[PDB]
Amino acid sequence: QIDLNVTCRYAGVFHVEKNGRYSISRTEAADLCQAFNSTLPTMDQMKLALSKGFETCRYGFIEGNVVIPRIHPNAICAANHTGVYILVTSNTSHYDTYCFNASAPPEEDCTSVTDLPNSFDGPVTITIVNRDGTRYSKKGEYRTHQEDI
Numbered sequence: 001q002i003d004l005n006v007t008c009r010y011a012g013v014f015h016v017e018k019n020g021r022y023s024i025s026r027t028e029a030a031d032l033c034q035a036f037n038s039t040l041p042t043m044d045q046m047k048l049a050l051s052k053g054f055e056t057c058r059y060g061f062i063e064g065n066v067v068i069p070r071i072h073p074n075a076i077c078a079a080n081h082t083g084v085y086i087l088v089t090s091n092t093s094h095y096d097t098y099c100f101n102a103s104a105p106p107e108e109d110c111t112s113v114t115d116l117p118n119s120f121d122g123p124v125t126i127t128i129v130n131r132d133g134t135r136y137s138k139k140g141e142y143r144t145h146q147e148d149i
């Protein structure tokens with residue numbers, strides 16, 4: 001079983017956390033976004049999302065970097081920084097991910113995610129968990145690198 005907690009989309013950008021813990025490698029992140037018919041966001045896509053209301057208190061991959069979007073300063077979320085905070089120094093390699101779906105609405109979309117449209121055949125029960133608790137499950141796989149499995 002894999003549980004994927006997903007946020008609202010902001011100009012197509014959303015956050016995904018796997019199994020309630022920082023647990024996604026950079027290769028898994030890319031695979032996960034693809035399974036959502038999405039891509040790792042660019043910095044510019046993130047910046048537009050943050051301008052529309054997107055913030056989290058989680059490190060996650062984008063294309064090229066690990067970031068936290070911050071609107072309000074909070075001392076335990078990117079050490080009180082605002083903006084798209086870029087992680088500079090870390091020993092470790094596993095984070096959450098962000099994803100970008102170009103077909104999402106242009107502003108804030110807090111409707112539930114109901115589908116992992118490009119997951120492939122496989123043995124895993126994958127459950128999408130929305131913040132309101134609504135869940136969607138399917139049997140499949142999305143990880144293409146053996147080292148991530």
Ligand SMILES: CC(=O)N[C@@H]1[C@@H](O[C@@H]2O[C@H](C(=O)O)[C@@H](O[C@@H]3O[C@H](CO)[C@@H](O)[C@H](O[C@@H]4O[C@H](C(=O)O)[C@@H](O[C@@H]5O[C@H](CO)[C@@H](O)[C@H](O[C@@H]6O[C@H](C(=O)O)[C@@H](O[C@@H]7O[C@H](CO)[C@@H](O)[C@H](O)[C@H]7NC(C)=O)[C@H](O)[C@H]6O)[C@H]5NC(C)=O)[C@H](O)[C@H]4O)[C@H]3NC(C)=O)[C@H](O)[C@H]2O)[C@H](O)[C@@H](CO)O[C@H]1O
Pocket residue numbers: 056057058059068074075076077078079080
């Ligand atoms: C120093 C040093 O060594 N080097 C410097 C470096 O320091 C490092 O910085 C890191 C950093 O990023 O800051 C540090 O990492 C953090 O360490 C902490 C201690 O170990 C960790 O706790 C923290 O983990 C994160 O904790 C968060 C937390 O809040 O505990 C977690 O986020 C929460 O997740 C919850 C579940 O998803 C969310 O529900 C919650 O959101 C809040 O939820 C509220 C609620 O629902 O109750 C909600 O309140 C409601 O809001 C509505 C509408 O707004 C109101 O109307 C309603 O009434 C409210 N209800 C009420 C009143 O109850 C809130 O709005 C909402 O925020 C999440 N919390 C937040 C804040 O969003 C998160 O999941 C954990 O990951 C670590 N942080 C991270 C990011 O991992 C590290 O320890 C440091 O070493 C510096 O960063 C660097 C700077 O350059 O410099 C180095 O030198």
